[PDB]
Amino acid sequence: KLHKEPATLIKAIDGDTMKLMYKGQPMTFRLLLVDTPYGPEASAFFKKMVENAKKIEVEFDKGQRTDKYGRGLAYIYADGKMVNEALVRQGLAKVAYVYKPNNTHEQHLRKSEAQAKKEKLNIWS
Ligand SMILES: Cc1cn([C@H]2C[C@H](OP(=O)(O)O)[C@@H](COP(=O)(O)O)O2)c(=O)[nH]c1=O
Ligand SMILES: [Ca+2]
């Protein structure tokens, strides 16, 4: 089963990438299963969500934990709320980069995207 692990925000980079302190080492992390462009709006939403959180958690999927750029690949939670899902639910990201076997939350995210699109939010306006 997947599990959540603590981490610390060092810096928000853009809509879907961040620097975290993870087990005592600074690392770039990249959100699984999403692509953010509405570029500046996606960056702003991500930054506010992670900076305001009191607790950040990393949840790796069941395959590779890093990409070819050395970035951690994870579902990131801000006070227990998944940031990847929050961005898609606002129409500030699309479900993208789906690489098996790291696809555990794909259906969940796809349903959020469908809602954003049905509500004509942001990218879908
Ligand atoms: C989200 C994700 C991206 N990537 C790669 C695909 C893209 O490669 P290329 O750079 O070769 O196109 C790149 C896009 O990331 P960004 O959207 O941060 O630029 O990161 C993965 O390998 N695994 C992943 O889970
Ligand atoms: Ca991107």
Q: In which element (H, E) is residue 10 found?
A: strand 5-12
For ligand 2, a single-atom ion, the residues with CB < 5 A are 16, 35-36
Q: What is the resolution of this structure in A?
A: 1.6
User: Which is nearest to 50 in space by CA: 22, 14, 23, 88?
Assistant: 14
Query: What sign does the dihedral 95-97-20-12 (CA atoms) show?
Result: negative
| Way it was determined | X-ray
Two tokens, residue 24? 């005592």
Rounded-to-integer distance, Cα 90 and Cα 117, Å: 9
Residue 95 in contact with ligand 1 by CB distance below 6 A = no
Q: Does domain 1-125 have CATH number 3.40.50.2300?
A: no
Region for 23 from its dihedrals, namely left if φ exceeds 0, alpha if ψ lies in -120 to 50, beta otherwise: left
Residue 14 in contact with ligand 1 by CB distance below 6 A = no
Instruction: Give the number of the atom of ligand 1 that is nearest the alpha carbon of residue 67.
Output: 22
Rounded-to-integer distance, Cα 87 and Cα 35, Å: 9
